[PDB]
Amino acid sequence: SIKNGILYLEDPVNHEWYPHYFVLTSSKIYYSEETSSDQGNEDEEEPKEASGSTELHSSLEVLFQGPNPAILEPEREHLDENSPLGDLLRGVLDVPACQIAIRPEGKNNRLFVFSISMPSVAQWSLDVAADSQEELQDWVKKIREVAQTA
């Protein structure tokens, strides 16, 4: 995961720019719709909860899982750790075999839009736009940076 942000894309659902999540790996491109899952595990439908006269409550253990809690597993660093479990990739592609094409005049009120296309897949043509003109230009350079090193 070298790059991560909210990149736009003409969704086939309504054929229009849609702000969907986007990820960039050293040698791959991922994308998803982003579900409504975000720590939504604190609301159970029950006839009111009830606490007893017995419980626990320690301290100093929480701080041992704050400042970089990924140190108690010296197996891999800056790698695909818990990727296929705590993210669930919806889409994937190969970045080291495509050709980007910045477009200073996409369409439908979109001057900043770079269209992608691989010369060895099926004459395909993708389109993506970044809110920040910098993120857009920086995104293209990255695709070329990972492609030039893969």
Domains of the chain (ranges; CATH) run 1-150 (2.30.29.30)
Distance CA 44, CA 47 (A): 10
- Which of 84, 80, 88, 75 shows the shortest CA–CA distance to 35? 88
Please say whether the beta carbons of 99 and 119 come within 8 A. Answer: yes
Torsion angle of alpha carbons 70, 147, 11, 135, nearest 10°? 70
Compute CA 108 distance to the chain's CA centroid, rounded to the nearest angstrom: 25
Tokens of 80: 């695909």
147 DSSP assignment: H
Residue 109 Ramachandran class (φ > 0 left, ψ -120 to 50 alpha, else beta): left
Distance CA 103, CA 53 (A): 66
Structural biology method used: NMR
